[PDB]
């Protein structure tokens, strides 16, 4: 059984590329207004959110736009839960709880790559900075697939975000700040 490793980038070139993208992306994401993301998404980009189907803070805020094809069967309801076009994509994102991610603790896997495609997954944690779940720690995996951007950047054409509650194991770790010992 291969030994579980962290982030996988393949080339330092894509590492710096992707990591840079995430810095800019989440700088805007946690800013208070995610509108600046309209430049990160393609005109006909897609976005959808999913949460665990299964007493920590509530995810009721994500339940409304939760897309689970395994559980939800109606083709028309399936279709509506999928945000299409950057306008709808970003309009939706701006409705989500304000956030503050731990970008530098992100574990990234670049799984696919061609001259026009770059698929990669992001795993990490983020605090909700307000609302009824303020100070709560969420965990998430987000998959983007990008096409080359006119500026050596990335244009996200596909974005699937999975939001969950950090497990007691993760929380313990994230918040630990013990005195140094030999």
């Amino acid at each position: 059984a291969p030994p579980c490793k962290g982030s996988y980038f393949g080339t330092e070139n894509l590492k710096s590329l992707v990591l840079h993208f995430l810095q800019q992306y989440y700088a805007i994401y946690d800013s208070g207004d995610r509108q600046g993301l309209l430049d990160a998404y393609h005109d006909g980009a897609c976005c959808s959110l999913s949460i665990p189907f299964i007493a920590r803070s509530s995810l009721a805020e994500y339940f409304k736009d939760s897309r689970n094809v395994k559980k939800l069967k109606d083709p028309t309801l399936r279709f509506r839960l999928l945000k299409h076009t950057r306008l709808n994509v970003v309009a939706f994102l701006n409705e989500l709880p304000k956030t503050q991610h731990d970008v530098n603790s992100f574990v990234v896997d670049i799984s696919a790559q061609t001259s026009t495609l770059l698929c990669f997954s992001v795993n990490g944690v983020f605090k909700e900075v307000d609302g009824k779940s303020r100070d709560s720690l969420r965990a998430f995996t987000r998959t983007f697939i990008a096409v080359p951007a006119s500026n050596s950047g990335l244009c996200i054409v596909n974005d699937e975000l999975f939001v969950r509650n950090a497990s007691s194991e993760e929380i313990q770790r994230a918040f630990a700040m013990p005195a140094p010992t030999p």
Partner: peptide, 6 residues
């Protein structure tokens, strides 16, 4: 296959 080049 470089991301972007073609």
């Amino acid at each position: 296959p470089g991301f972007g080049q073609g």
